[PDB]
Amino acid sequence: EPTCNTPSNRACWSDGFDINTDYEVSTPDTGVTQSYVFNLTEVDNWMGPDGVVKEKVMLINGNIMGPNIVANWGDTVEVTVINNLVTNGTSIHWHGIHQKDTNLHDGANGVTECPIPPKGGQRTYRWRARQYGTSWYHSHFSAQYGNGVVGTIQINGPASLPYDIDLGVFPITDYYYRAADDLVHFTQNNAPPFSDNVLINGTAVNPNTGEGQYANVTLTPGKRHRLRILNTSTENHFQVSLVNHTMTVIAADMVPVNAMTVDSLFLAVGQRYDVVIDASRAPDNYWFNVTFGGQAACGGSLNPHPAAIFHYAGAPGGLPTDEGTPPVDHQCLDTLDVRPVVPRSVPVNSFVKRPDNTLPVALDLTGTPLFVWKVNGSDINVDWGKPIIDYILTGNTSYPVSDNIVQVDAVDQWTYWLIENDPEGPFSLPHPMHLHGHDFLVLGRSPDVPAASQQRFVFDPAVDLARLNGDNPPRRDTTMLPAGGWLLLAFRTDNPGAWLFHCHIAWHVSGGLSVDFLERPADLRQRISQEDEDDFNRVCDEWRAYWPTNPYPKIDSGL
Template structure:
């Protein structure tokens, strides 16, 4: 009887236990916190599965014409589709992507946005920083481990290519901080031009305020309507179920406010970071950012609803179709009607979500700074380039040396020239904290992205930063892309735990193209060891092919 009583006590205790306390359970609609012998309680910053699985993809980058909103224009595509194929993996898998360049007069390369690349800086895919561009007719393979789980994206990091179509989503399946029934996959938001980004880039350069060009339209999952042409993307909801949507802003300049008429969003992750869930009616998402949200259909009418992505004009970015960036949510997949729902009145704001809501699930506190770096941004005449307007970050604008990337220079023992805008913290040891203060001196917001790290957001403010202002070091929001407020500042921190040369830059494509970046040199003595002799020889071979292409001077 005693043994029977103990057995019954164990069964009842297990049944009453919190789902987050259970281990070795299978991920499902009522146990999204589980992941086999792992769970959401395992901090992906320090531990991850080693599955032994490699997910392999081949990407061919080519030129063609496409009409995603009914207006035909030249594009550059991945495997002939827009957006490009979604990379899908499980937490702990390796991902191997072979990129073939079939462009006629452009190099290329793929960056895996927000992927930590822990001890794999060689796979970061950043032209002029970690590699030379892939020359026309050549190919290159990238391999990295999915140590994070959630939602990311990939894009070309060669000039303005991603604005012309070289983008796609990354989905890494893993445990979650809330339950849902169905994963509906990526919801890709982007502004859209009817001319190539290369043709319109000079408009931003010549504008005395540094404002990017006016966009005619924007797309959701590669579709929208423009002047009666084109079509809307469709998402099929199941009544009474909870649906996961993976929101990604792959745009060139626009901050969107996302919503679904008459629905709420439960936010469970920002970028690659799981957070404590919170509920909102809409969410702002800057260029490069991602949010994973759950939409509950319980109690909703079985009808068609509008999904909306409204460009925020307060970011001084003008979209001519701003009120009509839409997709359709259907509760009956057989329906062909246009929704009749109306939008709520929502605030137009060029800010990140309230940091009080963006609470990381895994608690990380930030230590004292070993180094403080300032990175003031301003738009100034560059006398060395015929007095063209360039974005200065600190003392110099960033000019990439595509045929002699930063990593190659550093491994050869060379110093980076001023025009590569170095932030040299290579002398610091392992696991030292670095604080970076970025100040915008113009009324323009900038989505700031640091490669190779999640940044800890210690402070954001719409004012000039002065010493002594309070900062939050107790489990602050952390993510790979943060909005620098217009005429304001952001204080970010990161730990020197990932040797490499990493780019810190504004993710407005035209701002980066015109100099808004710094090159971070981290743990300089360890970089050669990370590349190893084989990958270093491969980089040299790729650089030789690029030099022979004769395309170095091409934007």
């Protein structure tokens, strides 16, 4: 609970806790628990917000998204998940929540848990809110979250700029009328489709019939508003802009940053930005536009102009009349100019590229299906019925090859990872790379060029070491791997666990594009509670008894 957080002093939170506190190591002891119950149901012939009826959706508590989780910094969040789907298992992953020494609550089926079985299976997740900001949750059962198993997280805390009004969450997502498993099957042998629409806070107008509604945000004239923008898509990467207004970034993913004013923002799949908008212009209706850059390399929509309305209170109703001007083309790249308020410093001069720190991503066209994504030679394929944690608990280290285990034994040390984007393959695409368990430092990447330009880079210390930044670089949980290029990340091994590191485009992680960092496994078994072990085994027993009765095969990685 805050005691000094006010509009003119958002930096303050409570005694001992403010925007400069190192939240990764110091957490308020609030003693409070915020609990939720998620009931997952399978609904056929569901009428969506743009008027089109979808063949099948998978909903939390009967709505297009699950409830907005809300707690304070230092609370515990507890979610009972009850799976009333017909056939699918489910696992809910709390994206952006590092699960420090709570790996078994990460929701990564086949890694940290077996899936909760359908027809009434249940599990309760419990995690500490050791960060504040905007995050989200979604299924990790193959591409299930593309059917509706998704929602937002708002953990309140201090901020890097004063503001008057917290407008809350503003999730933006691609929207397909086809169901997720159908799209996974499709994308195994075909380029992915443009989205049928882009929803903004759950709604959009159908570009074809005019049904639906624009999201409508009311601004209080003369006031400073925090807007928590998310990209919860399965594939689309968005540019956002508000006509005639700038946006001031105060957080990137769940990491507060020094204020940074921009005219438009690029959000990768899974990224968030907290921004402050000053209602400083003439009272009117303004469009908030979603646009695409990068010559389609990171998505498009068949709605040519997805948008929301920002309405100044007291102004007329109606649609905005100024179409504004297109934002700069971000070329499928997030900005590396953000700077965390709580800094990190690491050396970059000593980096040496070696097989054991290099993750080559490659598209393999030579087998079945046609599009298979491999990392270091292997497409990931997890066993929902024998998760990596089961190996840890039984002392078996014979991990299957397709689990893509990258064992990291270093204890609370910075580890450096060079990811290479198929520079030798016939073509390469942008990928939004996401790490569970940690925020990474973005130490650098290949030179920024047009996403569709086919220019290729391989890391060369002679020119690239000097392009690296270890002086408080961007710190976040998702960033872009440039098409044709490379990306150098670092993270500190402060959290024993099995942690996925994967592309967040559903079609690609389905297709194999992940590894699993097995961090300090010799420390992990000691740190697993009896309750967590017992409940892991309970759910896996139920899952393993269920699975042979399932009528459908698993057709992808499981993730």
